[PDB]
Design a protein around this ligand. Structure first.
Ligand SMILES: *[C@@H]1O[C@H](CO)[C@@H](O)[C@H](O)[C@H]1NC(C)=O
Ligand SMILES: *[C@@H]1O[C@H](CO)[C@@H](O)[C@H](O)[C@H]1NC(C)=O
Lengths: 105, 75, 156, 105, 77, 73
C-alpha cells in the first residue's frame, strides 16, 4: 500500500499496436502503485519539494495533496516494427518503454 | 516544416494550430460518452500507426487542414 | 510480411551482446529485369532511403542461389555492379559453394545512394556456373525467395 | 482539471522549519494539479511508458491507473539557515525547492 | 561511517537497517489516527533540525541502535 | 542570533538575482584566542576572512569574533 514497482504485462493487441509492432507481442512494462505517506522512504528518493509539500499536506489535506508515486527511471527494450512507409525496422534500444525505478515526486 | 491543422479541442487557443502533422482522436472512457478532438501532433508519431480499438481512434494526416471534416468510428 | 532474417536478427539481439549497430532496416526489391548468352544477368531496382542524421555502418545484399535437378562444391560466382548510366562500377565477386542464401557486403554503393550528390537504387548481378554438378544456376527472381537489402545504421 | 502549475505558498512556521531556517520566512513553491487525460498534450511532455499505461488503463480502469501529474523540473532558491552545530550558513542554490515545470509520468 | 538502527516500520525489510543515522518519527495527518515509524535515514538531514508540531515528531540519533526504546509525544497545544 | 553581515549578504544575493557568486556556500563561525571550525570533507574551500576589518587568512583555515568562510562543492 506504499509507493513501489508492480508487475504490468502489456499485450499490444489490447491497445491496437499489433498492426505495426512485429515483435514482441507482449512485454513487461512495470507500474508504480501505492501512496506517498510521510515519512517517505529513502528508496523512494524524495526531492526537497516532495518533503515540503507532504508536510504542508499533513496540515491542509483538503487544500494541498500528497506527492505521487511515478516512474523515476525508464529502461529501453528491443522491438521490431514497421515505420510510416512500411519498412521493417529493428531498434535495439527503444527508450522509455519499461520502468526501472519508482519514486515520489 | 510545419502544417496548419484544425483546432477543436480544450487545449486549443484559437481555431487552428501549427505542428508537424494533423490529428483527429476519438476517445471513449468506459463510463462516459466518447469525445472527439482535432489538433496538431508533434511527439509520438507511433500512435498514428495503431489500429482503432473500441476505446480510441487516433487518426493522422500530413496535409493542410486535412483534419477539418473527417469523422471517425469506434470498434 | 517481414523477412525471416529480421526476426532471427531480433532473437539474436534479445539473447545474451551489445551490438554495434543501433538501427537495422530491411528494404525489399521493387522490380527486376532478366537479360538473355555467356552467363545469366539480372538488373535489380530498389528504393533505399536513410535519414540524413544517421551514419551508415554496414549494408548487406541477400540473394538465394540454386538450380534445378540438385557435392558441397559446385563452382559458382556472383558479380555485382553499381549502375550509373547507359557505366557500371565493380562492387563484389563471391564464389558460390552450395545452394541457399548468401550475404554480400555492398556498403559503398548504399552510402553513395543515401548521400546522392551525383542514378541510384539499381544494380546488375551476373551469375555463372562452371562444374558439372549443376549446369546452370541463378538467383531466385519473381516468376518466393526474392532478394532484399539490409542496412545497419547508428543515430549519431 | 488538467495537469498544470498552481500557486502554493509555504510558510516554514507551518511545518516547524522556522527553528533552523532564518530567511526567508515563507516562499513560493508551486504545485502540479490536474489530471492526465488522453490525449496527452505536448506541453505535458508525456513519456512512452505514460502513453502505454494510459492506453492500457482505458481498457482496464480498475486494474490499471492513469498517469500522474508531477513536477518534472525543480528550481533552487537562496536560503540562510543553521546546521546541526548551529553555524549560520547561506546557500545561494538550495536545490529542489520550487517547481519549474509539470508533466505526466 | 554507517550505523545500525532498529527497524519497526512497513518500509522495513528485516528487523534492522543500516544508514547514516537512526530515526523515530511520529506522524498524524489532520484527519487520521497517528502512526509511529522507526528506521534509518540517509537523505534529508534537515528533518532532524525541525521543531516538533502537532502533526509530526521527527527524532534522530547517531548511535548504534539508539532509536530502540526512545519515546515521543504529540500535542495540539 | 546571526550577525548582520550574513543577513546583509543574503539580501544582496536575492535582490539582484544576478550576483552569481563564485561560491555557493558561506559560513559564519563565532589578545590571542581561537575558534572551533569544521568544513565538509567533499567540498573545496574558496576564501576565508577573519572578521571591523577583512583579513585573508585562507592559508591557515586549510589546516586549522565572526570569521567568514567561502566554500563550494
Ligand atoms: C522511392 O524513392 C523516392 C526517392 O527517390 C521516394 O520519394 C519514394 O517515396 C519511394 N517510393 C515509395 C513507394 O515510397
Ligand atoms: C566543535 O565542537 C563540537 C562540540 O562542542 C565537537 O563535537 C566538534 O567535533 C568540534 N569541531 C571539530 C572540527 O572537531
Amino acid at each position: 500500500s506504499h509507493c513501489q514497482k508492480t508487475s504490468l504485462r502489456v499485450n499490444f493487441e489490447d491497445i491496437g499496436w499489433d498492426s505495426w509492432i512485429i515483435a514482441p507481442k507482449e512485454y513487461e512494462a512495470y507500474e508504480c502503485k501505492g501512496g506517498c505517506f510521510f515519512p517517505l522512504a529513502d528508496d523512494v528518493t524524495p526531492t526537497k519539494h516532495a518533503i515540503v509539500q507532504t508536510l504542508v499536506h499533513l496540515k491542509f489535506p483538503t487544500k494541498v495533496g500528497k506527492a505521487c508515486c511515478v516512474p523515476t527511471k525508464l529502461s529501453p527494450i528491443s522491438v521490431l516494427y514497421k515505420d510510416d512507409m512500411g519498412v521493417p525496422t529493428l531498434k535495439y534500444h527503444y527508450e522509455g518503454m519499461s520502468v526501472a525505478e519508482c519514486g515520489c515526486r | 516544416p510545419l502544417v496548419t491543422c484544425t483546432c477543436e479541442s480544450p487545449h486549443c487557443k484559437g481555431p487552428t494550430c501549427r505542428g508537424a502533422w494533423c490529428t483527429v482522436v476519438l476517445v471513449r472512457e468506459e463510463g462516459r460518452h466518447p469525445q472527439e478532438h482535432r489538433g496538431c501532433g508533434n511527439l509520438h508519431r507511433e500512435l498514428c500507426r495503431g489500429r482503432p480499438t473500441e476505446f480510441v481512434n487516433h487518426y493522422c494526416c500530413d496535409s493542410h487542414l486535412c483534419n477539418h471534416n473527417v469523422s471517425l468510428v469506434l470498434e | 510480411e517481414p523477412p525471416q532474417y529480421m526476426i532471427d536478427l531480433y532473437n539474436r539481439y534479445t539473447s545474451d551482446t551489445t551490438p554495434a549497430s543501433n538501427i537495422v532496416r530491411s528494404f525489399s526489391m521493387e522490380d527486376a529485369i532478366s537479360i538473355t548468352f555467356p552467363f545469366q544477368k539480372h538488373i535489380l531496382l530498389f528504393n533505399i532511403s536513410i535519414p540524413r542524421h544517421e551514419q551508415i555502418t554496414r549494408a548487406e545484399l541477400r540473394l538465394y542461389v540454386s538450380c534445378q535437378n540438385h557435392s558441397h562444391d559446385l563452382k559458382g560466382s556472383v558479380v555485382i555492379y553499381d549502375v550509373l548510366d547507359g557505366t557500371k562500377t565493380f562492387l563484389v565477386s563471391q564464389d558460390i559453394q552450395d545452394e541457399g542464401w548468401e550475404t554480400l557486403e555492398v556498403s559503398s554503393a548504399v552510402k553513395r545512394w543515401v548521400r546522392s550528390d551525383s542514378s541510384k537504387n539499381k544494380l546488375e548481378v551476373t551469375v555463372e556456373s562452371h562444374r558439372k554438378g549443376c549446369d546452370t544456376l541463378d538467383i531466385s527472381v519473381p516468376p518466393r525467395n526474392l532478394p532484399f537489402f539490409v542496412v545497419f545504421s547508428n543515430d549519431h
